[PDB]
């Protein structure tokens, strides 16, 4: 058997593409055997992303991988809810309960809330960017009204990298009018670094403020550059490094030849990269559900047209999305277990804070405690 | 660079066994497949079987119970064993490594080996 | 299952010439083929992956294309070391059967 499925990827994803490479080699199975078909295209423009859509339909694919913008994600949530074909995805949590969207990362309001209630706050900064939604914004602003709290909360995602530096320092200046001594920093893992390099450069990182980095990356980014300030600077892990099998994925790692694989010579792993390398897991071992519950749902790529009036769908793709959240295996991050809707239960999100010799886990969190 | 070398008896008699023992340099057997594949002279190229890096392995649908694939990590060896020859068994033999670049394909291979089964 | 096959078994060309070598399948592969050079002494190598790409070790003078079932592999210039066997991989549906392999020769 051939499983011919589609996977896009945007233009700069070169980590996650060779973290596919590592997945789709590690797990190969005995009873078939994936064709993925790649298309490197842009993720922001949303024809390109249809283009890339339609010719992987045309292809007859039974499922979808691959990454979307905060700019896109009603394009995707529509044709892959019409043609009932399931779409996975490591990119951030939707807002809503879409049919077909399989997610890998989990909740973040959820452990960025409770990291404010175990810390007691009352008046704090919110430094977030624009290009993942409002979700997390609407969600401290909802418990900031419903705990009396107080939000300064200041996007930074509209700055062009041009006059990054004097937009900043009057950033850092009209931050010091009511004397703001905690900020949260929700930005990727491009925007951080940044943010932390031009605070080292006006030098607001000595003990008595404090910082918290709003992603599961807490380990991507540079920490060597605070790690002598050291305020108290905390943050969120998805993949705990003192595992087994995260340990043998990390010696298996870092071996690798840059050359052949890009960005994989390094002693850590981007968060996006794991969620693909227990993506590739998950639908592998659907596939192999499939395989052994002897149903044959074998086809050829005539899957027709995308913009078919009416576009009448196949009804046994509808048990895929039942055969994905029938998947509950262990990957790097954790258990992974699913929902009728398609989010994650029963996950583990660490508590990690940079001491002096490194950053050490304080605790985990979860959703049922 | 990563290099491939096949050995093995040469001569064996019929209906008897045939161990062939391929060699791989320059990188790893632990994260990467070996494939298996026959070669008769004059003829089309025939996939003999496959191994992976998680102990997975298959063979060809026509003489599923006629080889079978071993591997040691520690020496970077792999040993297939053949069964039940024939006649025309009079073969060569290839050893290769599978990756994935959009596509499962074969990017380092072997010199490959000549097995003359007669009695 | 899925049967390649090549009608020509030997090319003949002189050094600087633009060579072309087709290959045929028994249904639509999606172009996931490979083409790949043998030479005589047993040591084969990889020249073109996923039947447009080209691999990193491989010179720049080789190229491939095709669609559907027809792929096809050019070669801009002949050189003395390019006098070898080359062979069509599929690689969609297993069991994963190659071509029939055709063998460059040097006119004269």
């Known amino acids: 058997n051939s499983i011919q499925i589609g996977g896009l990827f945007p233009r700069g994803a070169d980590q996650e593409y060779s973290a596919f490479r590592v997945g789709m080699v590690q797990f190969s199975t005995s009873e078939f055997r994936l064709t993925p078909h790649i298309d490197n295209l842009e993720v922001a423009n949303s024809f390109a992303v249809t283009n890339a859509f339609c010719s992987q339909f045309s292809r007859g694919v039974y499922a979808i991988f691959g990454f979307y913008d905060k700019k896109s994600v009603n394009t995707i949530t529509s044709f892959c809810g019409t043609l009932h074909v399931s779409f996975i995805t490591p990119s951030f949590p939707t807002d809503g309960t879409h049919p077909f969207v399989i997610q890998m990362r989990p909740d973040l309001k959820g452990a960025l809330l409770s990291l404010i209630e175990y810390y007691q706050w009352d008046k704090f900064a919110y430094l977030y960017d624009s290009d993942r939604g409002l979700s997390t914004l609407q969600a401290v602003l909802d418990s900031a009204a419903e705990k009396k709290w107080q939000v300064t909360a200041i996007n930074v995602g509209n700055i062009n990298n041009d006059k990054k530096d004097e937009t900043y320092r009057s950033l850092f200046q009209d931050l010091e009018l009511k004397k703001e001594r905690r900020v949260i920093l929700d930005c990727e893992r491009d925007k951080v670094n940044d943010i932390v390099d031009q605070v080292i450069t006006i030098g607001k990182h000595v003990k008595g403020y404090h910082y918290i980095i709003a992603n599961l990356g807490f380990t991507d980014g540079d920490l060597l550059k605070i790690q002598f300030g050291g305020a108290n600077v905390s943050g969120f892990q998805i993949v705990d490094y003192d595992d087994s099998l995260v340990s043998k994925f990390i010696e298996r790692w870092s071996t690798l030849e840059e050359k052949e694989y890009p960005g994989a010579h390094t002693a850590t792993i981007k968060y996006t990269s794991a969620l693909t390398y227990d993506a590739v897991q998950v639908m592998t071992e659907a596939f192999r559900n499939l395989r052994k519950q002897r149903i044959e749902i074998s086809r050829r790529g005539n899957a027709g047209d995308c913009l078919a009036n009416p576009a009448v769908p196949w009804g046994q793709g509808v048990e895929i999305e039942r055969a994905l959240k029938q998947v509950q295996v262990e990957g790097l991050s954790g258990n992974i277990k699913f929902d009728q809707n398609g989010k994650r239960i029963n996950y583990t999100i660490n508590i990690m804070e940079l001491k002096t010799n490194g950053p050490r886990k304080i605790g985990y969190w979860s959703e049922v405690d | 660079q990563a290099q491939l070398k096949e050995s093995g008896p040469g001569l064996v008699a019929p209906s008897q066994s045939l161990s062939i023992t391929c060699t791989v340099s320059?990188?790893?057997?632990?994260?990467?497949?070996v494939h298996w594949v026959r070669q008769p002279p004059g003829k089309g190229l025939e996939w003999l079987g496959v191994?992976?890096?998680?102990?997975?392995?298959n063979y060809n649908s026509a003489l599923m119970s006629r080889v079978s694939i071993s591997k040691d990590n520690s020496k970077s060896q792999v040993f297939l064993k053949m069964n039940s020859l024939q006649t025309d068994d009079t073969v060569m033999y290839y050893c290769?490594?599978?990756?994935?670049?959009?596509?499962?394909?074969?990017?380092?291979w072997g010199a490959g080996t000549t097995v003359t089964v007669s009695s | 299952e899925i049967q390649m096959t090549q009608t020509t078994s030997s090319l003949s060309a002189s050094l600087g010439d633009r060579v072309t070598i087709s290959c045929r399948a028994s249904?639509?592969?999606?172009?996931?083929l490979s083409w790949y050079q043998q030479k005589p002494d047993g040591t084969v190598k990889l020249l073109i992956y996923?039947?447009?790409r080209l691999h990193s070790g491989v010179p720049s003078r080789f190229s491939g294309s095709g669609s559907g079932i027809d792929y096809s592999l050019t070669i801009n210039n002949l050189e003395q070391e390019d006098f070898a066997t080359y062979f069509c991989?599929?690689?969609?549906?297993?069991?994963?059967?190659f071509g029939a392999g055709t063998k460059l020769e040097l006119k004269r």
């Open positions: 290769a490594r599978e990756d994935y670049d959009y596509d499962w394909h074969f990017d380092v």
């Open positions: 320059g990188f790893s057997l632990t994260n990467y497949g």
């Open positions: 191994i992976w890096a998680g102990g997975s392995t």
């Open positions: 249904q639509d592969i999606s172009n996931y």
């Open positions: 996923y039947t447009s």
């Open positions: 991989q599929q690689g969609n549906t297993l069991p994963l059967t």
